[PDB]
UniProtKB/Swiss-Prot annotation:
Annotated catalysed reactions: (6S)-5,6,7,8-tetrahydrofolate + NADP(+) = 7,8-dihydrofolate + NADPH + H(+)
Binding locations of NADP(+): 6-7, 14-19, 43-46, 62-65, 92-97, 100, 121
Domain DHFR: 1-156
Protein name: Dihydrofolate reductase
Keyword Electron transport: no
Family annotation (PANTHER family): DIHYDROFOLATE REDUCTASE
EC number: 1.5.1.3
Keyword Oxidoreductase set for record: yes
Length: 157
């Protein structure tokens, strides 16, 4: 299974200055639950922003850098390498990976951040006429999670 995993705002902002524009612990938990025990594929910039591989899952980084060799991280140098990865693979950003993979993935796990943030990187436009809403769940708000958000699972029609 090949899935997109992404949080984007009302205008499809996903990032600003190589970081997430929002602070939303519940979505990090969401990511943790979906991807633990499986595989995350991310572009080089996304990886460097995180700084270290995420625990308890396979971390795969796409880069043209032949010198890239980080402990706890597998490297790939081509999009086509993704298709050789076994198991449930999540395309985990950033903008370049999403643009390169959105027409190839089976489904998308999207957290819609229900606000308008300043961004410099975007999720590509998509239409619900191409995607069935398998599920849509409002995120619960609290003291630590104050931005409204919705968890979508979309499956390609
Ligand atoms: N909101 C979210 O769910 C979410 C999730 C992930 C990331 N983000 C955000 O996304 C932003 C980063 O996105 P970005 O587009 O700037 O960078 P990115 O996609 O994370 O990384 C781009 C790099 O990936 C490598 N790459 C991509 N395609 C390749 C290919 N076909 N062959 C070889 N290498 C390839 C290249 O690395 P080299 O230059 O080293 O060759 C390229 O420079 C950040 O702001 C981050 O916070 C948001
Ligand atoms: C966690 C935000 C997010 N949500 C959803 N639904 N899909 C994604 N692909 C990402 C993402 C991402 C990349 C990223 C993750 C993190 C991050 C931080 C903490 C945790 C964690 O505590 O589990 C996970 C990812 C930090 C920075 C960062 O890019 C700047």
């Amino acid at each position: 299974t090949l899935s997109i995993l992404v949080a984007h705002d009302l205008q499809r902002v996903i990032g600003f200055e190589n970081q997430l524009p929002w602070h939303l612990p519940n979505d990090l938990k969401h990511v943790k639950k979906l991807s633990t025990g499986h595989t995350l594929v991310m572009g080089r910039k996304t990886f460097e922003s995180i700084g270290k591989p995420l625990p308890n899952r396979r971390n795969v980084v796409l880069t043209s850098d032949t010198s890239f060799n980080v402990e706890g991280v597998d490297v790939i140098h081509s999009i086509e390498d993704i298709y050789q990865l076994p198991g449930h693979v999540f395309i985990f950003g950033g903008q370049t990976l999403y643009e390169e993979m959105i027409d190839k993935v089976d489904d998308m796990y999207i957290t819609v951040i229900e606000g308008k943030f300043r961004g410099d990187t975007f999720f590509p436009p998509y239409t619900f006429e191409d995607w069935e809403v398998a599920s849509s769940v409002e995120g619960k708000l609290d003291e630590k999670n104050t931005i409204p958000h919705t968890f979508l699972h979309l499956i390609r029609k």
